[PDB]
């Protein structure tokens, strides 16, 4: 049959464009979501109208806790249950908010380190334990070495995700599983953000003075899972329009 | 009084101990944090106090991630203020290190490896900064991008530590607190480790075919806390004998 | 139909790159220094597929007082043949040891000239003469764990990373993207094969070219200053 | 006897501060210079008046050419001729100016910006090692090499090559006991011709104190790397940039 993929946080924005584009490439998809139940079911309905029985949703909180490993095991299990295989994992879900050094701190750690680093690691474990062109793509951050002031925990999580991309690429290569990253600079700006601030950020991008479309991020993800990336593992592709190259 | 004070985590033994000794030799009063090594911590404090009265205290604390970790970290920093009326230097040296293959429960492994290596340093950094030649030195790892097989969680935590070193340096620079790292390659080898195994590692180091002494690592810490590094923040000094330059 | 220049295109990786660009519908300049018969054989094979879509261009890419003119000429040949030049692939490369303990200045001319200076000059000519415009530079995934006694080669490849970033920044306003592909062990010039995590073998040249094709494509329209490793995980492996 | 050091471009600015700190630590120094003759002799006179016969000057163009290997050989020779040894090499000399992609010919820009920043360090490294305790080489790198100034491609190329050299040499020279490390300023002494207004624009970007590194602060990191406190450090590049390289656009 057709291969299958899990995309975490796939209801909206970049995760949705990634699930759409995998689906358009021939993949059956698990649409993982946390709070965005309506958007998720909507996407699965649209994908299923195009090719019947090719999309499911799977709800899970990816905050760190003692039950996080079971939740991650269940995300992967949902793929096998719906499609009998799981070829691609996309770790796209992410918590993102400031945690100034100067919600309790335990919750902020559980959320930002959970979603960005620990859930990826556990999903990777469960993915590998259940196992052709198998691969995992982690959504990293091109700006990880030029961080946003007061985003220590978020930054820590994405740095840990780089660590994971490298470590898992090394350890899973003998099982023919490739592990890579796509690192957006500025792509879809936060919903909460005002328009003058959105423009502040746009104007900094060398290539076009505009943020990445979700489809442009998805395009790198498609490349990495594709047959044209069969010798690529442990690589992180910046998709940032040059933004990481720009000095203060 | 007028002598500065430093907290060193995991200071009972090995590198942390050498760091505590060297700081004390430089004129610092020291909090010797420990987890299980009470006898070692106390004997070091007694030796330091014999050299100069009332210049060393111990502080016991588990740095595993949990609900209570922020309160523990707060209490470590407090201990230095209670003992010495000031806290000039934080050395995040304590570390759990053991394999976590992708293919103790896993949530415990996460708590210990990510708590000690990343979360506890972040919480100690918050408490250090909130309580204020101030600086923080984090013990990193030079081999973080060429990691040992099946050490993904340990690798994640040490990458997260780089992230913290960079984020905290940027955020704390307005308060005049510098944040840097020392990244050993192979230093003191495991206790139980066979000499034939230790030699395999030693033979890989270009500079002298030997591991760094604990004092060599401490020397880079002393530099970073010193007036000779007053413009240095966000930097990670490898102290690895060229090990990280050696291809497979 | 867009047009591409590939340097060192007569053999091995540049050949695979030329063929793949051509197969994607580019017209191609096949640059060569000493490999005339091979360049022409490739041009003949590509012109049989689609006539008048492949030309050859001779140039020495050694650093010298005339390298700027040779680089200008390479870019010119594309514009002459095809009336446009959409893609520059800096693939040509000298590779050999230069122990710290051929004259040294010839080794500088070859190893730094071919690997870094010619890419710089070709970049200037390509830019001056100017849509999906991009430059791809063939980098090296093992640049930070360099081979023993290869200082000048490593210098040249680090300089090439510097150029990829600087040019991506400077040319972004012109809509010219500048990226890198960094092979590990590809076509050898068993022990090395054994060290590679992904399948204990070298990259074929086509695997390298696949990354080049992605980077020049519409699927990479937001990508500039990026270097894609294509090394099977070799650069992750410690000593 | 006292150890001896060669500092390239040592008449003024950071190079001078490194030679002065080396000298105050007990080194004998070769003050290399290219055009700054008065400033070089003046520095050696001041250093010799502190301790006799402890400083010499040495003139050379470090621009790339077929004679550059001889000039570099001669710099290192000058240390042996003066002091009987050469313990430390500081590659500090640097040409710095824009070379936009879209007076001097391009071949001259390549020769100066690549020559001074990368080829001369490589040739001086070869000579220093071939002419051979705590031996080391320190290369002055650039903390902002990955976030480069617009239109400085050749300069950036040169400094990237210098990183490459630092790593390759550290690795190849480790068996000889020679350490090779880098110190990478962000903004330290501003260019003499830069207006205060532009200087303050750069100052204001530095997280740690909104000011440039002093020459002494750069020199302090050099001193560290040559000292017994860094006897296990090779192939490391220490940023001394007050956080500048961490600041996003
Ligand atoms: N957007 C950018 O410019 C940019 C820049 C750098 C990196 N990135 C990275 O690119 C990826 C996609 O970016 P984005 O802006 O599309 O992401 P986003 O909208 O900020 O988040 C994507 C989804 O993650 C899920 N999520 C958040 N907390 C969660 C939790 N505790 N448990 C489970 N899921 C949770 C949410 O799902 P529900 O909606 O279902 O609750 C959310 O829709 C992310 O990993 C992000 O860090 C983006
Ligand atoms: N030695 C090396 O070659 C090497 C290589 C790379 C990086 N490093 C880094 O350099 C630093 C020092 O190295 P090392 O070899 O001296 O360290 P170590 O001996 O592995 O550990 C240092 C101390 O960490 C403390 N620790 C462990 N788990 C803890 C927990 N849950 N709570 C609180 N403390 C805990 C222990 O204290 P008690 O003994 O009191 O329980 C231990 O003695 C570490 O950060 C390490 O990761 C070392
Ligand atoms: N093969 C690998 O595993 C590997 C590993 C790391 C990096 N790379 C990089 O990948 C790229 C292509 O690799 P490759 O192995 O296919 O390259 P290669 O066979 O070593 O050389 C490619 C072409 O460069 C041209 N060339 C060499 N010196 C020249 C000069 N002075 N003037 C003009 N042209 C010159 C030659 O053209 P003529 O034949 O026409 O004389 C040669 O066929 C290179 O940039 C290389 O450094 C490859
Ligand atoms: N200043 C900063 O903020 C900063 C920032 C990043 C990196 N750096 C690096 O730090 C080092 C010191 O910086 P600086 O500002 O003190 O350097 P600088 O004043 O710009 O240059 C130092 C010396 O380089 C020598 N030099 C220039 N071209 C030469 C040639 N063709 N041959 C031989 N020598 C030549 C000159 O000697 P004469 O005077 O004798 O002609 C000059 O005094 C340099 O390597 C620089 O690239 C500095
Ligand atoms: O929406 C986001 C965003 O615009 C940005 C963003 C905005 C402006 C920037 O300069 C930048 O580097 C990131 O970052 C995110 C990181 C994680 C995530 O889940 C969402 C965002
Ligand atoms: O003791 C350790 C060690 O020898 C090594 C080590 C030994 C051999 C290696 O080749 C290496 O890269 C690290 O790593 C550690 C990391 C953390 C820690 O807390 C202790 C050690
Ligand atoms: O003087 C220099 C300078 O201020 C700077 C400089 C000034 C402002 C900046 O933001 C910066 O990144 C570098 O760079 C140099 C690089 C080489 C050199 O030889 C001298 C200088």
Tab-separated table of N, CA, C and O in Angstrom, chain B residues 108-198:
chain	number	residue	atom	x	y	z
B	108	UNK	N	12.380	8.198	34.622
B	108	UNK	CA	13.436	8.440	35.607
B	108	UNK	C	14.735	8.877	34.907
B	108	UNK	O	15.465	9.748	35.365
B	109	UNK	N	15.042	8.193	33.814
B	109	UNK	CA	16.263	8.523	33.033
B	109	UNK	C	16.188	9.969	32.528
B	109	UNK	O	17.168	10.688	32.621
B	110	UNK	N	15.019	10.378	32.049
B	110	UNK	CA	14.779	11.773	31.667
B	110	UNK	C	14.984	12.719	32.851
B	110	UNK	O	15.752	13.726	32.716
B	111	UNK	N	14.349	12.423	33.996
B	111	UNK	CA	14.485	13.266	35.174
B	111	UNK	C	15.936	13.472	35.550
B	111	UNK	O	16.320	14.582	35.888
B	112	UNK	N	16.706	12.384	35.565
B	112	UNK	CA	18.077	12.456	36.049
B	112	UNK	C	18.979	13.109	35.014
B	112	UNK	O	19.740	14.025	35.336
B	113	UNK	N	18.904	12.618	33.777
B	113	UNK	CA	19.850	13.113	32.759
B	113	UNK	C	19.571	14.545	32.326
B	113	UNK	O	20.522	15.333	32.172
B	114	UNK	N	18.294	14.879	32.137
B	114	UNK	CA	17.913	16.223	31.736
B	114	UNK	C	17.888	17.114	32.969
B	114	UNK	O	18.308	18.257	32.873
B	115	UNK	N	17.466	16.607	34.131
B	115	UNK	CA	17.468	17.443	35.387
B	115	UNK	C	18.864	17.898	35.750
B	115	UNK	O	19.132	19.126	35.842
B	116	UNK	N	19.781	16.933	35.934
B	116	UNK	CA	21.136	17.305	36.361
B	116	UNK	C	21.847	18.180	35.336
B	116	UNK	O	22.476	19.136	35.705
B	117	UNK	N	21.784	17.801	34.052
B	117	UNK	CA	22.596	18.438	33.017
B	117	UNK	C	22.034	19.726	32.510
B	117	UNK	O	22.779	20.541	32.032
B	118	UNK	N	20.722	19.954	32.632
B	118	UNK	CA	20.129	21.122	32.007
B	118	UNK	C	19.159	21.891	32.931
B	118	UNK	O	19.260	23.098	33.086
B	119	UNK	N	18.209	21.179	33.508
B	119	UNK	CA	17.127	21.864	34.231
B	119	UNK	C	17.656	22.480	35.535
B	119	UNK	O	17.387	23.683	35.853
B	120	UNK	N	18.386	21.691	36.286
B	120	UNK	CA	18.977	22.186	37.513
B	120	UNK	C	19.911	23.401	37.232
B	120	UNK	O	19.782	24.425	37.904
B	121	UNK	N	20.834	23.303	36.222
B	121	UNK	CA	21.597	24.538	35.889
B	121	UNK	C	20.713	25.748	35.571
B	121	UNK	O	21.076	26.865	35.934
B	122	UNK	N	19.588	25.555	34.888
B	122	UNK	CA	18.689	26.684	34.562
B	122	UNK	C	18.092	27.255	35.869
B	122	UNK	O	18.031	28.440	36.017
B	123	UNK	N	17.636	26.377	36.766
B	123	UNK	CA	16.998	26.793	38.016
B	123	UNK	C	18.028	27.443	38.962
B	123	UNK	O	17.726	28.467	39.591
B	124	UNK	N	19.224	26.888	39.004
B	124	UNK	CA	20.320	27.507	39.772
B	124	UNK	C	20.668	28.896	39.210
B	124	UNK	O	20.870	29.823	39.970
B	125	UNK	N	20.772	29.004	37.891
B	125	UNK	CA	21.016	30.291	37.198
B	125	UNK	C	19.899	31.323	37.556
B	125	UNK	O	20.217	32.509	37.819
B	126	UNK	N	18.628	30.914	37.505
B	126	UNK	CA	17.514	31.840	37.871
B	126	UNK	C	17.684	32.323	39.302
B	126	UNK	O	17.577	33.530	39.581
B	127	UNK	N	17.943	31.384	40.218
B	127	UNK	CA	18.017	31.720	41.645
B	127	UNK	C	19.266	32.582	41.878
B	127	UNK	O	19.203	33.538	42.620
B	128	UNK	N	20.383	32.255	41.193
B	128	UNK	CA	21.634	33.028	41.341
B	128	UNK	C	21.379	34.516	40.919
B	128	UNK	O	21.760	35.484	41.625
B	129	UNK	N	20.728	34.672	39.777
B	129	UNK	CA	20.497	35.978	39.188
B	129	UNK	C	19.450	36.766	40.011
B	129	UNK	O	19.630	37.973	40.226
B	130	UNK	N	18.413	36.075	40.489
B	130	UNK	CA	17.357	36.765	41.211
B	130	UNK	C	17.852	37.299	42.551
B	130	UNK	O	17.339	38.277	43.050
B	131	UNK	N	18.876	36.666	43.104
B	131	UNK	CA	19.429	37.042	44.387
B	131	UNK	C	20.452	38.172	44.334
B	131	UNK	O	20.886	38.634	45.390
B	132	UNK	N	20.831	38.627	43.144
B	132	UNK	CA	21.848	39.676	43.014
B	132	UNK	C	21.183	41.039	43.150
B	132	UNK	O	20.983	41.492	44.276
B	133	UNK	N	32.182	41.158	39.728
B	133	UNK	CA	32.724	40.085	38.939
B	133	UNK	C	31.889	38.830	39.129
B	133	UNK	O	32.389	37.778	39.598
B	134	UNK	N	30.619	38.954	38.794
B	134	UNK	CA	29.699	37.847	38.905
B	134	UNK	C	29.780	36.983	37.644
B	134	UNK	O	29.718	37.490	36.532
B	135	UNK	N	29.905	35.667	37.832
B	135	UNK	CA	29.779	34.804	36.666
B	135	UNK	C	29.325	33.404	36.943
B	135	UNK	O	29.350	32.927	38.095
B	136	UNK	N	28.866	32.753	35.870
B	136	UNK	CA	28.374	31.375	35.928
B	136	UNK	C	29.236	30.620	34.921
B	136	UNK	O	29.513	31.134	33.806
B	137	UNK	N	29.665	29.439	35.319
B	137	UNK	CA	30.422	28.571	34.410
B	137	UNK	C	29.694	27.249	34.375
B	137	UNK	O	29.526	26.572	35.418
B	138	UNK	N	29.299	26.838	33.181
B	138	UNK	CA	28.668	25.540	32.989
B	138	UNK	C	29.621	24.490	32.398
B	138	UNK	O	30.334	24.789	31.444
B	139	UNK	N	29.626	23.291	32.970
B	139	UNK	CA	30.476	22.211	32.442
B	139	UNK	C	29.731	21.531	31.324
B	139	UNK	O	28.755	20.826	31.522
B	140	UNK	N	30.269	21.773	30.127
B	140	UNK	CA	29.661	21.278	28.886
B	140	UNK	C	30.368	19.967	28.454
B	140	UNK	O	30.820	19.171	29.323
B	141	UNK	N	30.403	19.703	27.158
B	141	UNK	CA	31.037	18.496	26.651
B	141	UNK	C	31.574	18.831	25.282
B	141	UNK	O	30.842	19.347	24.438
B	142	UNK	N	32.847	18.546	25.043
B	142	UNK	CA	33.408	18.908	23.710
B	142	UNK	C	32.903	17.986	22.573
B	142	UNK	O	33.055	18.328	21.407
B	143	UNK	N	32.371	16.810	22.924
B	143	UNK	CA	32.047	15.789	21.935
B	143	UNK	C	30.555	15.745	21.636
B	143	UNK	O	30.053	14.778	21.087
B	144	UNK	N	29.883	16.834	21.951
B	144	UNK	CA	28.435	16.958	21.834
B	144	UNK	C	27.906	16.772	20.404
B	144	UNK	O	26.815	16.251	20.232
B	145	UNK	N	28.700	17.146	19.408
B	145	UNK	CA	28.300	16.898	17.988
B	145	UNK	C	28.881	15.614	17.400
B	145	UNK	O	28.672	15.352	16.221
B	146	UNK	N	29.632	14.837	18.195
B	146	UNK	CA	30.110	13.538	17.763
B	146	UNK	C	29.874	12.608	18.927
B	146	UNK	O	30.843	12.136	19.587
B	147	UNK	N	28.607	12.393	19.228
B	147	UNK	CA	28.307	11.836	20.521
B	147	UNK	C	28.571	10.313	20.626
B	147	UNK	O	28.636	9.631	19.607
B	148	UNK	N	28.745	9.789	21.835
B	148	UNK	CA	28.870	8.337	22.020
B	148	UNK	C	27.568	7.687	21.669
B	148	UNK	O	26.492	8.221	21.944
B	149	UNK	N	27.662	6.509	21.066
B	149	UNK	CA	26.478	5.706	20.712
B	149	UNK	C	25.577	5.446	21.934
B	149	UNK	O	26.083	5.078	22.993
B	150	UNK	N	24.275	5.673	21.788
B	150	UNK	CA	23.255	5.289	22.800
B	150	UNK	C	23.268	6.191	24.039
B	150	UNK	O	22.784	5.784	25.056
B	151	UNK	N	23.779	7.431	23.902
B	151	UNK	CA	23.771	8.458	24.946
B	151	UNK	C	22.861	9.660	24.588
B	151	UNK	O	23.219	10.822	24.842
B	152	UNK	N	21.690	9.382	23.989
B	152	UNK	CA	20.899	10.464	23.427
B	152	UNK	C	20.429	11.417	24.529
B	152	UNK	O	20.531	12.619	24.329
B	153	UNK	N	19.976	10.888	25.681
B	153	UNK	CA	19.436	11.771	26.703
B	153	UNK	C	20.559	12.592	27.281
B	153	UNK	O	20.394	13.777	27.571
B	154	UNK	N	21.697	11.941	27.533
B	154	UNK	CA	22.865	12.702	28.094
B	154	UNK	C	23.227	13.831	27.056
B	154	UNK	O	23.471	15.000	27.419
B	155	UNK	N	23.290	13.463	25.768
B	155	UNK	CA	23.609	14.425	24.673
B	155	UNK	C	22.614	15.562	24.589
B	155	UNK	O	22.950	16.742	24.394
B	156	UNK	N	21.346	15.200	24.706
B	156	UNK	CA	20.294	16.214	24.730
B	156	UNK	C	20.517	17.209	25.872
B	156	UNK	O	20.322	18.420	25.693
B	157	UNK	N	20.814	16.678	27.052
B	157	UNK	CA	20.970	17.560	28.225
B	157	UNK	C	22.167	18.475	28.039
B	157	UNK	O	22.072	19.638	28.411
B	158	UNK	N	23.273	17.967	27.513
B	158	UNK	CA	24.445	18.801	27.324
B	158	UNK	C	24.243	19.806	26.186
B	158	UNK	O	24.791	20.890	26.278
B	159	UNK	N	23.496	19.461	25.130
B	159	UNK	CA	23.163	20.472	24.117
B	159	UNK	C	22.282	21.506	24.731
B	159	UNK	O	22.459	22.703	24.427
B	160	UNK	N	21.315	21.057	25.550
B	160	UNK	CA	20.416	22.031	26.242
B	160	UNK	C	21.281	22.971	27.108
B	160	UNK	O	20.974	24.145	27.178
B	161	UNK	N	22.366	22.443	27.680
B	161	UNK	CA	23.230	23.280	28.489
B	161	UNK	C	23.913	24.406	27.681
B	161	UNK	O	24.115	25.503	28.185
B	162	UNK	N	24.335	24.076	26.461
B	162	UNK	CA	24.931	25.091	25.529
B	162	UNK	C	23.891	26.189	25.332
B	162	UNK	O	24.202	27.398	25.363
B	163	UNK	N	22.665	25.744	25.032
B	163	UNK	CA	21.555	26.666	24.825
B	163	UNK	C	21.453	27.593	26.029
B	163	UNK	O	21.352	28.804	25.865
B	164	UNK	N	21.462	27.036	27.225
B	164	UNK	CA	21.279	27.838	28.450
B	164	UNK	C	22.465	28.832	28.542
B	164	UNK	O	22.272	30.033	28.914
B	165	UNK	N	23.671	28.344	28.226
B	165	UNK	CA	24.873	29.174	28.361
B	165	UNK	C	24.744	30.396	27.479
B	165	UNK	O	24.926	31.551	27.970
B	166	UNK	N	24.305	30.168	26.242
B	166	UNK	CA	24.024	31.270	25.311
B	166	UNK	C	22.859	32.151	25.713
B	166	UNK	O	22.997	33.367	25.732
B	167	UNK	N	21.711	31.558	26.006
B	167	UNK	CA	20.536	32.380	26.418
B	167	UNK	C	20.767	33.178	27.682
B	167	UNK	O	20.420	34.357	27.720
B	168	UNK	N	21.372	32.549	28.691
B	168	UNK	CA	21.569	33.204	29.999
B	168	UNK	C	22.634	34.273	29.797
B	168	UNK	O	22.553	35.335	30.394
B	169	UNK	N	23.628	34.011	28.959
B	169	UNK	CA	24.626	35.073	28.743
B	169	UNK	C	23.971	36.345	28.138
B	169	UNK	O	24.283	37.490	28.537
B	170	UNK	N	23.076	36.144	27.189
B	170	UNK	CA	22.471	37.263	26.550
B	170	UNK	C	21.556	38.020	27.550
B	170	UNK	O	21.623	39.256	27.658
B	171	UNK	N	20.751	37.261	28.283
B	171	UNK	CA	19.768	37.823	29.196
B	171	UNK	C	20.394	38.482	30.447
B	171	UNK	O	19.843	39.427	30.965
B	172	UNK	N	21.492	37.941	30.945
B	172	UNK	CA	22.110	38.371	32.226
B	172	UNK	C	23.199	39.459	32.022
B	172	UNK	O	23.674	40.070	32.989
B	173	UNK	N	23.631	39.624	30.766
B	173	UNK	CA	24.649	40.647	30.431
B	173	UNK	C	24.268	42.056	30.924
B	173	UNK	O	25.135	42.725	31.478
B	174	UNK	N	22.966	42.470	30.829
B	174	UNK	CA	22.596	43.787	31.457
B	174	UNK	C	22.864	43.889	32.979
B	174	UNK	O	23.169	44.968	33.471
B	175	UNK	N	22.882	42.769	33.703
B	175	UNK	CA	23.164	42.753	35.143
B	175	UNK	C	24.639	42.540	35.437
B	175	UNK	O	25.049	42.454	36.607
B	176	UNK	N	25.437	42.426	34.394
B	176	UNK	CA	26.878	42.263	34.555
B	176	UNK	C	27.258	40.839	34.973
B	176	UNK	O	28.335	40.630	35.541
B	177	UNK	N	26.370	39.869	34.734
B	177	UNK	CA	26.681	38.492	35.108
B	177	UNK	C	27.098	37.881	33.783
B	177	UNK	O	26.325	37.880	32.783
B	178	UNK	N	28.305	37.323	33.772
B	178	UNK	CA	28.840	36.646	32.598
B	178	UNK	C	28.476	35.166	32.700
B	178	UNK	O	28.351	34.626	33.801
B	179	UNK	N	28.311	34.506	31.559
B	179	UNK	CA	27.921	33.047	31.558
B	179	UNK	C	28.705	32.385	30.475
B	179	UNK	O	28.582	32.783	29.290
B	180	UNK	N	29.476	31.372	30.840
B	180	UNK	CA	30.389	30.717	29.899
B	180	UNK	C	30.348	29.235	30.186
B	180	UNK	O	29.727	28.813	31.123
B	181	UNK	N	31.092	28.480	29.397
B	181	UNK	CA	31.183	27.076	29.586
B	181	UNK	C	32.605	26.577	29.395
B	181	UNK	O	33.410	27.228	28.751
B	182	UNK	N	32.890	25.438	30.011
B	182	UNK	CA	34.138	24.681	29.837
B	182	UNK	C	33.676	23.337	29.327
B	182	UNK	O	32.780	22.713	29.914
B	183	UNK	N	34.249	22.896	28.217
B	183	UNK	CA	33.806	21.642	27.581
B	183	UNK	C	34.976	20.669	27.540
B	183	UNK	O	35.802	20.712	26.608
B	184	UNK	N	35.016	19.732	28.517
B	184	UNK	CA	36.016	18.706	28.482
B	184	UNK	C	35.807	17.769	27.320
B	184	UNK	O	34.663	17.611	26.840
B	185	UNK	N	36.892	17.157	26.868
B	185	UNK	CA	36.773	16.030	25.912
B	185	UNK	C	36.802	14.729	26.726
B	185	UNK	O	35.728	14.266	27.195
B	186	UNK	N	37.984	14.119	26.905
B	186	UNK	CA	38.080	13.057	27.932
B	186	UNK	C	38.918	13.600	29.077
B	186	UNK	O	40.058	14.087	28.896
B	187	UNK	N	38.308	13.635	30.252
B	187	UNK	CA	39.014	14.027	31.432
B	187	UNK	C	39.032	12.746	32.254
B	187	UNK	O	39.196	11.630	31.685
B	188	UNK	N	38.936	12.884	33.580
B	188	UNK	CA	38.925	11.729	34.492
B	188	UNK	C	37.993	10.637	33.995
B	188	UNK	O	36.787	10.861	33.821
B	189	UNK	N	38.557	9.455	33.788
B	189	UNK	CA	37.744	8.352	33.242
B	189	UNK	C	36.906	7.703	34.350
B	189	UNK	O	37.211	7.928	35.516
B	190	UNK	N	35.903	6.904	34.003
B	190	UNK	CA	35.078	6.245	35.025
B	190	UNK	C	35.940	5.486	36.036
B	190	UNK	O	36.985	4.955	35.664
B	191	UNK	N	35.491	5.424	37.263
B	191	UNK	CA	36.175	4.716	38.327
B	191	UNK	C	36.442	3.247	38.036
B	191	UNK	O	37.525	2.731	38.188
B	192	UNK	N	35.398	2.559	37.672
B	192	UNK	CA	35.531	1.134	37.466
B	192	UNK	C	36.224	0.742	36.174
B	192	UNK	O	36.720	-0.344	36.051
B	193	UNK	N	36.199	1.635	35.211
B	193	UNK	CA	36.793	1.397	33.894
B	193	UNK	C	38.156	0.713	33.796
B	193	UNK	O	39.152	1.222	34.311
B	194	UNK	N	38.197	-0.442	33.129
B	194	UNK	CA	39.495	-1.118	32.901
B	194	UNK	C	40.585	-0.240	32.299
B	194	UNK	O	40.291	0.569	31.432
B	195	UNK	N	41.845	-0.382	32.758
B	195	UNK	CA	42.958	0.355	32.124
B	195	UNK	C	43.043	0.131	30.610
B	195	UNK	O	43.347	1.086	29.855
B	196	UNK	N	42.756	-1.097	30.145
B	196	UNK	CA	42.781	-1.352	28.696
B	196	UNK	C	41.720	-0.486	27.979
B	196	UNK	O	42.019	0.082	26.911
B	197	UNK	N	40.534	-0.340	28.606
B	197	UNK	CA	39.464	0.570	28.083
B	197	UNK	C	39.876	2.034	28.199
B	197	UNK	O	39.729	2.771	27.224
B	198	UNK	N	40.450	2.449	29.339
B	198	UNK	CA	40.917	3.850	29.499
B	198	UNK	C	41.939	4.262	28.428
B	198	UNK	O	41.890	5.395	27.891
